[PDB]
Amino acid sequence: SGFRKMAFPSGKVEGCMVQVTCGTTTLNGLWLDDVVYCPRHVICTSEDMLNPNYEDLLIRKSNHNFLVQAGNVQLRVIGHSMQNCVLKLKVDTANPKTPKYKFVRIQPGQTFSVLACYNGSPSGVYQCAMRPNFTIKGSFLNGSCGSVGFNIDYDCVSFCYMHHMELPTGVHAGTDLEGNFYGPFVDRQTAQAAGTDTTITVNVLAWLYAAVINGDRWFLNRFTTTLNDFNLVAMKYNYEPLTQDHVDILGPLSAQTGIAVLDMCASLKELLQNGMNGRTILGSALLEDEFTPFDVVRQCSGVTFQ
Amino acid sequence: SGFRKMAFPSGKVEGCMVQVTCGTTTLNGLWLDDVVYCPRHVICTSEDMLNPNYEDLLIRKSNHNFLVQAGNVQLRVIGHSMQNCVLKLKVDTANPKTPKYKFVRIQPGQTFSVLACYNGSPSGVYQCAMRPNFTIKGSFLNGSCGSVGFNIDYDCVSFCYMHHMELPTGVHAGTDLEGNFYGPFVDRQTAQAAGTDTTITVNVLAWLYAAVINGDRWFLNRFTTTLNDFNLVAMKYNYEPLTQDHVDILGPLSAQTGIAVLDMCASLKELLQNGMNGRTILGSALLEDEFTPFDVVRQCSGVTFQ
Ligand SMILES: [Zn+2]
Numbered sequence A, B: 001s002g003f004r005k006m007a008f009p010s011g012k013v014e015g016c017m018v019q020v021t022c023g024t025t026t027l028n029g030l031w032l033d034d035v036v037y038c039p040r041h042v043i044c045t046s047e048d049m050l051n052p053n054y055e056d057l058l059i060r061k062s063n064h065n066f067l068v069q070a071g072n073v074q075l076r077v078i079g080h081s082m083q084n085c086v087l088k089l090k091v092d093t094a095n096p097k098t099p100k101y102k103f104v105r106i107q108p109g110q111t112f113s114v115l116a117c118y119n120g121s122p123s124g125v126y127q128c129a130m131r132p133n134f135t136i137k138g139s140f141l142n143g144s145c146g147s148v149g150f151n152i153d154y155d156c157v158s159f160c161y162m163h164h165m166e167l168p169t170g171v172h173a174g175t176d177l178e179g180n181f182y183g184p185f186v187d188r189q190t191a192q193a194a195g196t197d198t199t200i201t202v203n204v205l206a207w208l209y210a211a212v213i214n215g216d217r218w219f220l221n222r223f224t225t226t227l228n229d230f231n232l233v234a235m236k237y238n239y240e241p242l243t244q245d246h247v248d249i250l251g252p253l254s255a256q257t258g259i260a261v262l263d264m265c266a267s268l269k270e271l272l273q274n275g276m277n278g279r280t281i282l283g284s285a286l287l288e289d290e291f292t293p294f295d296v297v298r299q300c301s302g303v304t305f306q
Protein backbone atom coordinates (compact mmCIF):
# COMPACT_ATOMS: atom_id res chain seq x y z
CA SER A 1 0.00 0.00 0.00
CA GLY A 2 0.92 3.76 0.17
CA PHE A 3 0.23 6.56 -2.27
CA ARG A 4 2.86 8.82 -3.89
CA LYS A 5 2.93 11.48 -6.55
CA MET A 6 4.38 9.30 -9.24
CA ALA A 7 5.74 10.09 -12.68
CA PHE A 8 5.79 7.68 -15.61
CA PRO A 9 9.12 5.92 -16.16
CA SER A 10 11.03 8.30 -18.38
CA GLY A 11 13.33 6.01 -20.41
CA LYS A 12 11.27 6.05 -23.61
CA VAL A 13 11.38 9.87 -23.58
CA GLU A 14 15.03 10.09 -22.55
CA GLY A 15 15.83 8.29 -25.86
CA CYS A 16 14.19 11.18 -27.78
CA MET A 17 15.91 14.21 -26.25
CA VAL A 18 18.42 16.21 -28.25
CA GLN A 19 20.11 19.60 -28.02
CA VAL A 20 19.13 22.30 -30.55
CA THR A 21 21.29 25.46 -30.97
CA CYS A 22 20.53 28.36 -33.31
CA GLY A 23 23.09 31.21 -33.12
CA THR A 24 23.67 31.82 -29.41
CA THR A 25 20.41 30.14 -28.17
CA THR A 26 20.56 26.47 -26.94
CA LEU A 27 17.49 24.51 -25.84
CA ASN A 28 16.01 21.02 -26.12
CA GLY A 29 14.34 19.22 -28.98
CA LEU A 30 12.28 16.07 -29.25
CA TRP A 31 13.53 13.60 -31.96
CA LEU A 32 10.81 11.26 -33.26
CA ASP A 33 11.30 9.43 -36.54
CA ASP A 34 13.23 11.85 -38.79
CA VAL A 35 11.83 15.08 -37.22
CA VAL A 36 13.14 17.15 -34.30
CA TYR A 37 10.49 19.38 -32.69
CA CYS A 38 11.56 22.42 -30.68
CA PRO A 39 10.24 25.85 -29.63
CA ARG A 40 10.43 28.39 -32.45
CA HIS A 41 12.01 30.93 -30.06
CA VAL A 42 15.28 29.07 -30.51
CA ILE A 43 15.78 31.57 -33.40
CA CYS A 44 15.42 34.60 -31.06
CA THR A 45 18.02 36.66 -29.20
CA SER A 46 17.01 37.85 -25.70
CA GLU A 47 16.36 41.23 -27.50
CA ASP A 48 14.14 39.56 -30.21
CA MET A 49 11.86 38.07 -27.47
CA LEU A 50 10.42 41.53 -26.59
CA ASN A 51 8.47 41.78 -29.97
CA PRO A 52 9.51 38.93 -32.29
CA ASN A 53 8.25 38.62 -35.87
CA TYR A 54 8.96 34.93 -36.25
CA GLU A 55 8.33 34.61 -40.00
CA ASP A 56 10.77 37.49 -40.60
CA LEU A 57 13.38 36.09 -38.15
CA LEU A 58 13.08 32.62 -39.63
CA ILE A 59 13.91 33.90 -43.17
CA ARG A 60 17.43 34.69 -41.96
CA LYS A 61 18.01 31.04 -40.87
CA SER A 62 19.07 28.14 -43.04
CA ASN A 63 19.12 24.38 -42.35
CA HIS A 64 22.83 24.63 -41.45
CA ASN A 65 22.14 27.26 -38.74
CA PHE A 66 20.15 24.67 -36.68
CA LEU A 67 22.72 22.54 -34.83
CA VAL A 68 21.17 19.32 -33.55
CA GLN A 69 23.19 17.02 -31.36
CA ALA A 70 22.07 13.61 -29.99
CA GLY A 71 24.56 12.65 -27.30
CA ASN A 72 28.06 13.23 -28.74
CA VAL A 73 26.69 12.83 -32.30
CA GLN A 74 25.62 15.56 -34.75
CA LEU A 75 22.43 15.16 -36.85
CA ARG A 76 22.19 16.59 -40.35
CA VAL A 77 19.26 18.99 -40.91
CA ILE A 78 17.72 18.59 -44.35
CA GLY A 79 14.66 20.82 -43.91
CA HIS A 80 12.89 23.09 -41.51
CA SER A 81 9.36 24.39 -41.15
CA MET A 82 7.35 26.40 -38.64
CA GLN A 83 4.05 24.95 -37.39
CA ASN A 84 2.35 27.37 -35.00
CA CYS A 85 4.88 27.97 -32.21
CA VAL A 86 7.13 24.96 -32.92
CA LEU A 87 9.81 24.28 -35.47
CA LYS A 88 10.07 20.93 -37.17
CA LEU A 89 13.61 20.15 -38.23
CA LYS A 90 13.79 17.34 -40.71
CA VAL A 91 16.93 15.28 -40.18
CA ASP A 92 18.51 12.64 -42.40
CA THR A 93 18.36 9.87 -39.75
CA ALA A 94 15.31 8.39 -38.03
CA ASN A 95 15.71 8.21 -34.24
CA PRO A 96 16.46 4.46 -33.73
CA LYS A 97 14.94 4.75 -30.20
CA THR A 98 11.58 6.24 -31.41
CA PRO A 99 8.83 4.72 -29.21
CA LYS A 100 5.25 4.18 -30.26
CA TYR A 101 3.81 7.67 -29.86
CA LYS A 102 0.86 10.03 -30.25
CA PHE A 103 0.47 13.80 -30.02
CA VAL A 104 -2.48 14.81 -27.96
CA ARG A 105 -3.90 17.99 -26.63
CA ILE A 106 -5.00 17.67 -22.98
CA GLN A 107 -7.73 19.46 -21.06
CA PRO A 108 -7.27 21.35 -17.77
CA GLY A 109 -7.25 19.01 -14.89
CA GLN A 110 -5.31 16.27 -16.76
CA THR A 111 -1.93 15.26 -15.31
CA PHE A 112 1.31 14.38 -17.11
CA SER A 113 4.92 13.72 -16.42
CA VAL A 114 7.66 16.22 -17.33
CA LEU A 115 11.18 15.20 -18.19
CA ALA A 116 13.17 18.37 -17.32
CA CYS A 117 16.21 18.62 -19.53
CA TYR A 118 19.17 20.98 -20.16
CA ASN A 119 21.47 20.89 -23.27
CA GLY A 120 19.58 17.82 -24.50
CA SER A 121 20.39 15.95 -21.21
CA PRO A 122 17.66 14.71 -18.84
CA SER A 123 17.91 15.95 -15.27
CA GLY A 124 14.73 14.88 -13.56
CA VAL A 125 11.17 13.73 -13.84
CA TYR A 126 8.08 15.00 -12.05
CA GLN A 127 4.46 14.97 -12.19
CA CYS A 128 2.15 17.94 -12.70
CA ALA A 129 -1.25 19.03 -14.05
CA MET A 130 -2.64 21.40 -16.64
CA ARG A 131 -4.20 24.03 -14.32
CA PRO A 132 -7.70 25.47 -15.02
CA ASN A 133 -6.02 28.74 -16.06
CA PHE A 134 -3.87 26.81 -18.66
CA THR A 135 -0.58 27.26 -16.78
CA ILE A 136 1.53 24.54 -15.21
CA LYS A 137 3.59 24.82 -12.04
CA GLY A 138 6.89 23.25 -13.07
CA SER A 139 10.58 23.47 -12.38
CA PHE A 140 12.22 25.09 -15.42
CA LEU A 141 15.54 26.97 -15.39
CA ASN A 142 17.14 28.78 -18.38
CA GLY A 143 17.89 26.10 -20.96
CA SER A 144 14.85 23.89 -20.12
CA CYS A 145 12.75 25.12 -23.04
CA GLY A 146 11.75 22.22 -25.29
CA SER A 147 11.44 19.82 -22.34
CA VAL A 148 8.24 17.77 -22.82
CA GLY A 149 5.31 16.40 -20.91
CA PHE A 150 3.78 13.05 -21.57
CA ASN A 151 1.66 10.13 -20.43
CA ILE A 152 2.36 6.42 -21.24
CA ASP A 153 -0.28 3.74 -21.99
CA TYR A 154 1.64 0.40 -21.93
CA ASP A 155 4.21 1.05 -24.69
CA CYS A 156 2.73 4.19 -26.33
CA VAL A 157 3.93 7.67 -25.31
CA SER A 158 1.32 10.40 -25.63
CA PHE A 159 3.18 13.69 -25.84
CA CYS A 160 1.02 16.56 -24.56
CA TYR A 161 3.31 19.49 -23.63
CA MET A 162 6.43 21.28 -24.73
CA HIS A 163 7.82 23.98 -22.43
CA HIS A 164 8.18 27.51 -23.84
CA MET A 165 7.62 30.35 -21.29
CA GLU A 166 7.84 31.42 -17.61
CA LEU A 167 5.36 34.16 -16.82
CA PRO A 168 6.48 37.11 -14.66
CA THR A 169 4.71 35.32 -11.65
CA GLY A 170 6.95 32.21 -12.03
CA VAL A 171 4.29 29.82 -13.43
CA HIS A 172 4.80 28.14 -16.80
CA ALA A 173 3.27 28.10 -20.26
CA GLY A 174 3.76 25.99 -23.30
CA THR A 175 2.32 24.22 -26.27
CA ASP A 176 1.07 20.88 -27.49
CA LEU A 177 3.31 19.15 -30.06
CA GLU A 178 1.37 20.88 -32.88
CA GLY A 179 2.80 24.13 -31.47
CA ASN A 180 -0.50 25.54 -30.16
CA PHE A 181 -0.19 27.17 -26.74
CA TYR A 182 -2.40 26.02 -23.93
CA GLY A 183 -4.51 28.96 -22.87
CA PRO A 184 -4.05 32.51 -24.13
CA PHE A 185 -0.27 32.69 -23.75
CA VAL A 186 2.19 33.74 -26.43
CA ASP A 187 5.89 33.34 -27.03
CA ARG A 188 6.79 36.96 -26.40
CA GLN A 189 8.32 38.64 -23.31
CA THR A 190 5.25 40.79 -22.52
CA ALA A 191 2.59 41.31 -19.78
CA GLN A 192 0.81 38.00 -19.56
CA ALA A 193 -1.04 37.49 -16.33
CA ALA A 194 -2.67 34.19 -15.39
CA GLY A 195 -6.33 33.90 -14.34
CA THR A 196 -7.62 32.34 -11.17
CA ASP A 197 -5.86 29.08 -10.38
CA THR A 198 -8.87 27.15 -9.15
CA THR A 199 -8.70 23.75 -7.55
CA ILE A 200 -9.53 20.67 -9.63
CA THR A 201 -12.40 19.27 -7.61
CA VAL A 202 -12.75 15.87 -9.31
CA ASN A 203 -9.07 15.25 -8.69
CA VAL A 204 -9.35 16.16 -4.98
CA LEU A 205 -12.23 13.70 -4.66
CA ALA A 206 -10.17 10.99 -6.37
CA TRP A 207 -7.33 11.63 -3.94
CA LEU A 208 -9.72 11.42 -0.94
CA TYR A 209 -10.75 7.95 -2.26
CA ALA A 210 -7.01 7.12 -2.48
CA ALA A 211 -6.71 8.23 1.16
CA VAL A 212 -9.52 5.94 2.33
CA ILE A 213 -8.09 2.95 0.38
CA ASN A 214 -4.63 3.70 1.91
CA GLY A 215 -6.23 3.97 5.50
CA ASP A 216 -6.50 7.71 6.06
CA ARG A 217 -10.13 8.02 7.05
CA TRP A 218 -10.48 10.62 9.80
CA PHE A 219 -12.25 13.14 7.46
CA LEU A 220 -15.16 10.75 6.66
CA ASN A 221 -18.30 12.17 8.22
CA ARG A 222 -22.01 11.50 8.75
CA PHE A 223 -23.22 13.87 5.98
CA THR A 224 -24.23 13.89 2.32
CA THR A 225 -24.89 16.73 -0.13
CA THR A 226 -26.14 17.37 -3.65
CA LEU A 227 -24.20 18.57 -6.69
CA ASN A 228 -25.90 21.93 -6.52
CA ASP A 229 -25.30 22.39 -2.77
CA PHE A 230 -21.71 21.25 -3.08
CA ASN A 231 -21.15 23.61 -6.00
CA LEU A 232 -22.28 26.61 -3.97
CA VAL A 233 -19.39 25.80 -1.57
CA ALA A 234 -16.99 25.02 -4.48
CA MET A 235 -17.62 28.42 -5.92
CA LYS A 236 -17.00 30.18 -2.60
CA TYR A 237 -13.61 28.31 -2.25
CA ASN A 238 -12.37 28.70 -5.83
CA TYR A 239 -13.00 25.03 -6.73
CA GLU A 240 -14.10 23.94 -10.17
CA PRO A 241 -17.80 23.07 -10.38
CA LEU A 242 -18.48 19.32 -10.15
CA THR A 243 -20.52 17.87 -13.03
CA GLN A 244 -22.42 14.62 -13.44
CA ASP A 245 -19.65 13.62 -15.86
CA HIS A 246 -17.21 13.91 -12.94
CA VAL A 247 -19.51 11.86 -10.71
CA ASP A 248 -19.58 9.16 -13.44
CA ILE A 249 -15.77 9.13 -13.70
CA LEU A 250 -15.51 8.56 -9.92
CA GLY A 251 -17.92 5.56 -10.11
CA PRO A 252 -15.25 2.84 -9.92
CA LEU A 253 -13.65 4.37 -6.83
CA SER A 254 -17.06 4.74 -5.24
CA ALA A 255 -17.86 1.07 -6.03
CA GLN A 256 -14.47 -0.16 -4.49
CA THR A 257 -14.80 1.86 -1.26
CA GLY A 258 -18.61 1.73 -0.92
CA ILE A 259 -18.55 5.53 -0.33
CA ALA A 260 -21.07 7.30 -2.55
CA VAL A 261 -19.61 10.18 -4.51
CA LEU A 262 -21.96 12.73 -2.93
CA ASP A 263 -20.99 11.43 0.53
CA MET A 264 -17.32 12.12 -0.35
CA CYS A 265 -18.41 15.54 -1.61
CA ALA A 266 -19.91 16.20 1.86
CA SER A 267 -16.57 15.21 3.45
CA LEU A 268 -14.84 17.64 1.11
CA LYS A 269 -17.33 20.39 1.92
CA GLU A 270 -16.58 19.92 5.64
CA LEU A 271 -12.78 20.03 4.99
CA LEU A 272 -13.23 23.30 3.08
CA GLN A 273 -15.38 24.95 5.74
CA ASN A 274 -13.49 23.58 8.81
CA GLY A 275 -9.95 23.17 7.55
CA MET A 276 -7.72 20.28 8.54
CA ASN A 277 -7.22 21.46 12.18
CA GLY A 278 -3.49 20.61 11.99
CA ARG A 279 -4.16 17.04 10.59
CA THR A 280 -2.80 15.49 7.37
CA ILE A 281 -4.16 13.29 4.55
CA LEU A 282 -1.62 11.11 2.68
CA GLY A 283 1.16 13.29 4.06
CA SER A 284 -0.38 16.56 2.89
CA ALA A 285 -1.81 19.50 4.89
CA LEU A 286 -3.49 20.78 1.64
CA LEU A 287 -6.18 19.06 -0.44
CA GLU A 288 -4.18 17.60 -3.35
CA ASP A 289 -5.51 18.11 -6.85
CA GLU A 290 -2.75 16.71 -9.14
CA PHE A 291 -4.07 13.10 -9.22
CA THR A 292 -6.74 12.28 -11.74
CA PRO A 293 -9.30 9.55 -11.09
CA PHE A 294 -7.40 7.41 -13.64
CA ASP A 295 -4.13 8.06 -11.80
CA VAL A 296 -5.68 6.93 -8.53
CA VAL A 297 -7.09 3.74 -10.09
CA ARG A 298 -3.75 2.99 -11.76
CA GLN A 299 -1.65 3.44 -8.65
CA CYS A 300 -4.13 1.65 -6.35
CA SER A 301 -4.21 -1.39 -8.90
CA GLY A 302 -0.43 -1.72 -9.97
CA VAL A 303 -0.52 -0.94 -13.78
CA THR A 304 2.79 -1.31 -15.71
CA PHE A 305 4.41 -0.13 -19.01
CA GLN A 306 6.67 -2.12 -21.47
CA SER B 1 12.42 28.93 -11.89
CA GLY B 2 10.04 26.75 -9.76
CA PHE B 3 10.80 23.89 -7.42
CA ARG B 4 9.35 20.35 -7.66
CA LYS B 5 9.88 17.04 -5.96
CA MET B 6 11.87 15.49 -8.73
CA ALA B 7 13.06 11.95 -9.33
CA PHE B 8 16.12 10.99 -11.35
CA PRO B 9 15.41 9.93 -14.93
CA SER B 10 14.71 6.23 -14.65
CA GLY B 11 15.82 4.82 -18.03
CA LYS B 12 19.15 3.42 -16.84
CA VAL B 13 17.31 1.48 -14.12
CA GLU B 14 14.41 0.43 -16.35
CA GLY B 15 17.03 -1.46 -18.45
CA CYS B 16 17.94 -3.55 -15.37
CA MET B 17 14.51 -4.75 -14.21
CA VAL B 18 13.51 -8.37 -14.58
CA GLN B 19 10.82 -10.68 -13.23
CA VAL B 20 11.84 -13.44 -10.78
CA THR B 21 9.44 -16.31 -9.96
CA CYS B 22 10.12 -19.14 -7.50
CA GLY B 23 7.21 -21.60 -7.13
CA THR B 24 4.08 -19.46 -6.80
CA THR B 25 5.88 -16.21 -5.74
CA THR B 26 6.66 -13.53 -8.43
CA LEU B 27 8.58 -10.33 -7.70
CA ASN B 28 11.23 -8.11 -9.28
CA GLY B 29 14.95 -8.53 -9.68
CA LEU B 30 17.77 -6.20 -10.61
CA TRP B 31 20.02 -7.52 -13.47
CA LEU B 32 23.54 -6.04 -13.43
CA ASP B 33 26.33 -7.76 -15.35
CA ASP B 34 25.63 -11.51 -15.04
CA VAL B 35 23.88 -11.33 -11.62
CA VAL B 36 20.19 -10.84 -10.78
CA TYR B 37 19.59 -9.55 -7.23
CA CYS B 38 16.22 -10.09 -5.58
CA PRO B 39 14.68 -10.43 -2.10
CA ARG B 40 15.31 -13.86 -0.57
CA HIS B 41 11.61 -14.11 0.40
CA VAL B 42 10.90 -15.02 -3.22
CA ILE B 43 11.42 -18.61 -1.93
CA CYS B 44 8.64 -18.25 0.70
CA THR B 45 4.95 -19.12 0.58
CA SER B 46 2.60 -16.69 2.40
CA GLU B 47 2.64 -19.41 5.18
CA ASP B 48 6.51 -19.52 5.26
CA MET B 49 6.65 -15.72 5.92
CA LEU B 50 5.28 -16.14 9.49
CA ASN B 51 8.57 -17.85 10.74
CA PRO B 52 10.86 -18.60 7.78
CA ASN B 53 14.15 -20.49 8.14
CA TYR B 54 15.70 -19.24 4.93
CA GLU B 55 18.75 -21.53 4.84
CA ASP B 56 16.44 -24.54 5.26
CA LEU B 57 13.93 -23.26 2.65
CA LEU B 58 16.69 -22.46 0.20
CA ILE B 59 18.03 -26.07 0.32
CA ARG B 60 14.83 -27.21 -1.41
CA LYS B 61 15.45 -24.85 -4.39
CA SER B 62 17.64 -25.48 -7.39
CA ASN B 63 18.88 -23.11 -10.13
CA HIS B 64 16.03 -24.29 -12.39
CA ASN B 65 13.38 -23.30 -9.79
CA PHE B 66 14.32 -19.58 -10.19
CA LEU B 67 12.58 -18.35 -13.36
CA VAL B 68 14.08 -15.08 -14.57
CA GLN B 69 12.51 -13.26 -17.46
CA ALA B 70 13.79 -10.03 -19.09
CA GLY B 71 10.99 -8.73 -21.28
CA ASN B 72 9.69 -11.68 -23.33
CA VAL B 73 13.07 -13.46 -22.96
CA GLN B 74 14.08 -16.12 -20.42
CA LEU B 75 17.52 -16.00 -18.71
CA ARG B 76 19.37 -19.16 -17.77
CA VAL B 77 20.32 -19.42 -14.06
CA ILE B 78 23.71 -21.02 -13.57
CA GLY B 79 24.14 -20.41 -9.83
CA HIS B 80 22.48 -18.98 -6.79
CA SER B 81 23.66 -17.73 -3.42
CA MET B 82 22.19 -15.97 -0.40
CA GLN B 83 23.89 -12.81 0.86
CA ASN B 84 22.14 -11.49 3.96
CA CYS B 85 18.52 -10.91 2.89
CA VAL B 86 19.10 -10.96 -0.88
CA LEU B 87 19.60 -13.73 -3.39
CA LYS B 88 22.15 -13.41 -6.14
CA LEU B 89 21.21 -15.43 -9.19
CA LYS B 90 24.08 -15.92 -11.54
CA VAL B 91 22.86 -15.95 -15.14
CA ASP B 92 24.68 -16.99 -18.31
CA THR B 93 24.25 -13.59 -20.04
CA ALA B 94 25.52 -10.18 -18.93
CA ASN B 95 22.81 -7.50 -19.06
CA PRO B 96 23.76 -5.59 -22.27
CA LYS B 97 22.11 -2.45 -20.77
CA THR B 98 24.17 -2.53 -17.49
CA PRO B 99 24.96 1.11 -16.59
CA LYS B 100 27.97 2.26 -14.63
CA TYR B 101 26.91 1.47 -11.07
CA LYS B 102 27.78 1.37 -7.38
CA PHE B 103 26.10 -0.17 -4.33
CA VAL B 104 25.94 2.19 -1.44
CA ARG B 105 24.38 2.23 1.95
CA ILE B 106 22.69 5.56 2.73
CA GLN B 107 22.13 7.33 6.03
CA PRO B 108 18.77 8.59 7.35
CA GLY B 109 17.88 11.86 5.83
CA GLN B 110 19.30 10.96 2.37
CA THR B 111 16.85 10.97 -0.55
CA PHE B 112 16.62 8.60 -3.52
CA SER B 113 14.38 7.77 -6.40
CA VAL B 114 12.28 4.59 -6.49
CA LEU B 115 11.31 2.84 -9.68
CA ALA B 116 8.12 0.98 -8.65
CA CYS B 117 7.76 -2.18 -10.69
CA TYR B 118 5.40 -5.18 -11.01
CA ASN B 119 6.22 -8.47 -12.85
CA GLY B 120 9.57 -6.97 -13.92
CA SER B 121 7.73 -4.00 -15.59
CA PRO B 122 8.26 -0.38 -14.48
CA SER B 123 5.13 1.50 -13.47
CA GLY B 124 6.29 4.75 -11.98
CA VAL B 125 9.06 6.77 -10.43
CA TYR B 126 9.03 8.87 -7.28
CA GLN B 127 11.21 10.46 -4.85
CA CYS B 128 11.51 9.66 -1.15
CA ALA B 129 13.87 9.69 1.85
CA MET B 130 15.33 7.26 4.33
CA ARG B 131 13.43 8.35 7.48
CA PRO B 132 15.25 8.74 10.86
CA ASN B 133 13.48 5.56 12.03
CA PHE B 134 14.90 3.63 8.98
CA THR B 135 11.54 3.26 7.22
CA ILE B 136 10.52 4.81 3.91
CA LYS B 137 7.06 6.03 2.96
CA GLY B 138 6.59 4.54 -0.50
CA SER B 139 3.90 3.23 -2.79
CA PHE B 140 4.27 -0.56 -2.94
CA LEU B 141 1.48 -3.02 -3.81
CA ASN B 142 1.76 -6.84 -3.79
CA GLY B 143 4.31 -7.74 -6.45
CA SER B 144 6.51 -4.62 -5.94
CA CYS B 145 9.12 -6.40 -3.84
CA GLY B 146 12.55 -6.14 -5.45
CA SER B 147 11.85 -2.63 -6.78
CA VAL B 148 14.94 -0.48 -6.15
CA GLY B 149 15.97 2.96 -5.03
CA PHE B 150 18.84 4.86 -6.50
CA ASN B 151 20.63 8.13 -7.12
CA ILE B 152 22.49 9.08 -10.37
CA ASP B 153 25.75 11.09 -10.60
CA TYR B 154 26.14 11.93 -14.33
CA ASP B 155 26.24 8.39 -15.81
CA CYS B 156 26.75 6.29 -12.63
CA VAL B 157 23.77 4.74 -10.81
CA SER B 158 24.22 4.34 -7.07
CA PHE B 159 21.77 1.69 -5.93
CA CYS B 160 20.82 2.19 -2.28
CA TYR B 161 17.53 0.34 -1.61
CA MET B 162 15.66 -2.80 -2.50
CA HIS B 163 12.06 -3.11 -1.29
CA HIS B 164 11.17 -6.08 0.94
CA MET B 165 8.46 -5.37 3.59
CA GLU B 166 5.35 -3.32 4.50
CA LEU B 167 4.97 -2.96 8.24
CA PRO B 168 1.50 -3.38 9.80
CA THR B 169 1.30 0.54 9.91
CA GLY B 170 1.72 0.78 6.09
CA VAL B 171 5.30 2.19 6.04
CA HIS B 172 8.06 0.32 4.21
CA ALA B 173 11.29 -1.48 4.97
CA GLY B 174 14.05 -2.88 2.86
CA THR B 175 17.71 -3.50 2.32
CA ASP B 176 20.78 -2.14 0.63
CA LEU B 177 22.04 -4.19 -2.34
CA GLU B 178 24.26 -6.23 0.03
CA GLY B 179 20.99 -7.48 1.55
CA ASN B 180 21.34 -5.71 4.91
CA PHE B 181 18.09 -4.17 6.15
CA TYR B 182 17.99 -0.51 7.01
CA GLY B 183 17.12 -0.23 10.66
CA PRO B 184 16.08 -3.14 12.86
CA PHE B 185 13.57 -4.70 10.47
CA VAL B 186 13.49 -8.33 9.37
CA ASP B 187 11.96 -10.27 6.53
CA ARG B 188 9.35 -12.04 8.62
CA GLN B 189 5.60 -11.33 9.04
CA THR B 190 5.83 -10.41 12.75
CA ALA B 191 5.27 -7.43 15.14
CA GLN B 192 7.66 -4.79 13.93
CA ALA B 193 6.77 -1.32 15.05
CA ALA B 194 8.59 1.77 13.81
CA GLY B 195 10.11 4.38 16.15
CA THR B 196 9.43 8.07 16.12
CA ASP B 197 9.38 9.48 12.60
CA THR B 198 11.17 12.73 13.31
CA THR B 199 11.56 15.53 10.83
CA ILE B 200 14.86 15.93 8.98
CA THR B 201 15.79 19.44 10.05
CA VAL B 202 18.71 20.05 7.67
CA ASN B 203 16.46 19.12 4.77
CA VAL B 204 13.70 21.51 5.90
CA LEU B 205 16.26 24.31 6.07
CA ALA B 206 17.49 23.46 2.56
CA TRP B 207 13.92 23.61 1.29
CA LEU B 208 13.36 27.01 2.98
CA TYR B 209 16.44 28.26 1.04
CA ALA B 210 14.84 26.79 -2.12
CA ALA B 211 11.68 28.76 -1.24
CA VAL B 212 13.56 32.05 -0.93
CA ILE B 213 15.44 31.47 -4.23
CA ASN B 214 12.07 30.62 -5.91
CA GLY B 215 10.43 33.84 -4.36
CA ASP B 216 8.49 32.51 -1.40
CA ARG B 217 9.75 34.76 1.36
CA TRP B 218 6.89 35.63 3.70
CA PHE B 219 8.33 33.47 6.57
CA LEU B 220 11.64 35.42 6.73
CA ASN B 221 11.73 37.30 10.01
CA ARG B 222 13.80 39.74 12.07
CA PHE B 223 15.28 37.08 14.42
CA THR B 224 18.33 34.85 14.85
CA THR B 225 19.05 31.95 17.20
CA THR B 226 21.86 29.63 18.25
CA LEU B 227 22.25 25.91 17.59
CA ASN B 228 21.56 25.13 21.22
CA ASP B 229 18.46 27.37 21.43
CA PHE B 230 17.14 26.06 18.13
CA ASN B 231 17.72 22.48 19.27
CA LEU B 232 15.60 22.98 22.38
CA VAL B 233 12.69 23.81 20.00
CA ALA B 234 13.64 20.96 17.59
CA MET B 235 13.42 18.50 20.41
CA LYS B 236 10.00 19.76 21.52
CA TYR B 237 8.68 19.39 17.88
CA ASN B 238 10.21 16.00 17.06
CA TYR B 239 12.88 17.47 14.73
CA GLU B 240 16.34 16.01 14.43
CA PRO B 241 19.01 18.00 16.28
CA LEU B 242 20.97 20.36 14.01
CA THR B 243 24.76 19.91 14.12
CA GLN B 244 27.63 22.12 13.00
CA ASP B 245 28.13 19.57 10.21
CA HIS B 246 24.62 20.43 8.98
CA VAL B 247 25.38 24.16 9.21
CA ASP B 248 28.51 23.55 7.08
CA ILE B 249 26.52 21.61 4.45
CA LEU B 250 24.08 24.55 4.14
CA GLY B 251 26.97 27.02 3.56
CA PRO B 252 26.56 27.28 -0.23
CA LEU B 253 22.85 28.05 0.04
CA SER B 254 23.56 30.60 2.74
CA ALA B 255 26.24 32.23 0.54
CA GLN B 256 23.83 32.41 -2.54
CA THR B 257 20.90 33.91 -0.61
CA GLY B 258 22.91 35.99 1.90
CA ILE B 259 20.72 34.48 4.69
CA ALA B 260 22.86 33.14 7.53
CA VAL B 261 22.02 29.59 8.50
CA LEU B 262 21.12 30.55 12.08
CA ASP B 263 18.81 33.29 10.72
CA MET B 264 16.99 30.61 8.68
CA CYS B 265 16.89 28.47 11.83
CA ALA B 266 15.10 31.38 13.58
CA SER B 267 12.56 31.49 10.72
CA LEU B 268 12.03 27.76 11.15
CA LYS B 269 11.65 28.13 14.91
CA GLU B 270 8.91 30.74 14.33
CA LEU B 271 7.12 28.45 11.80
CA LEU B 272 7.16 25.63 14.36
CA GLN B 273 5.83 27.74 17.21
CA ASN B 274 3.31 29.80 15.16
CA GLY B 275 2.32 27.45 12.37
CA MET B 276 1.70 28.59 8.81
CA ASN B 277 -1.59 30.44 9.61
CA GLY B 278 -3.21 29.01 6.45
CA ARG B 279 -0.23 30.07 4.19
CA THR B 280 1.89 27.87 1.89
CA ILE B 281 5.59 27.53 0.99
CA LEU B 282 6.41 26.07 -2.47
CA GLY B 283 2.87 24.72 -2.65
CA SER B 284 3.04 22.93 0.70
CA ALA B 285 1.15 23.58 3.97
CA LEU B 286 3.72 21.34 5.81
CA LEU B 287 7.47 21.92 6.21
CA GLU B 288 8.95 19.59 3.57
CA ASP B 289 11.85 17.39 4.59
CA GLU B 290 12.48 15.14 1.53
CA PHE B 291 14.95 17.50 -0.23
CA THR B 292 18.56 17.30 0.79
CA PRO B 293 20.86 20.32 0.57
CA PHE B 294 22.48 18.65 -2.47
CA ASP B 295 19.05 18.16 -4.07
CA VAL B 296 18.25 21.84 -3.61
CA VAL B 297 21.59 22.95 -5.10
CA ARG B 298 21.15 20.56 -8.03
CA GLN B 299 17.64 21.64 -8.90
CA CYS B 300 18.32 25.37 -8.36
CA SER B 301 21.50 25.06 -10.73
CA GLY B 302 20.21 22.69 -13.60
CA VAL B 303 22.49 19.56 -13.25
CA THR B 304 22.06 16.80 -15.91
CA PHE B 305 22.83 13.05 -16.38
CA GLN B 306 24.11 11.20 -19.55
ZN1 LIG C 1 13.47 29.43 -24.10
Ligand SMILES: [Zn+2]
Pocket (backbone or CB within 6 Å): B027, B039, B041, B143, B145, B164
Ligand atom coordinates in the same frame (compact mmCIF):
# COMPACT_ATOMS: atom_id res chain seq x y z
ZN1 LIG D 1 7.43 -9.67 -1.25
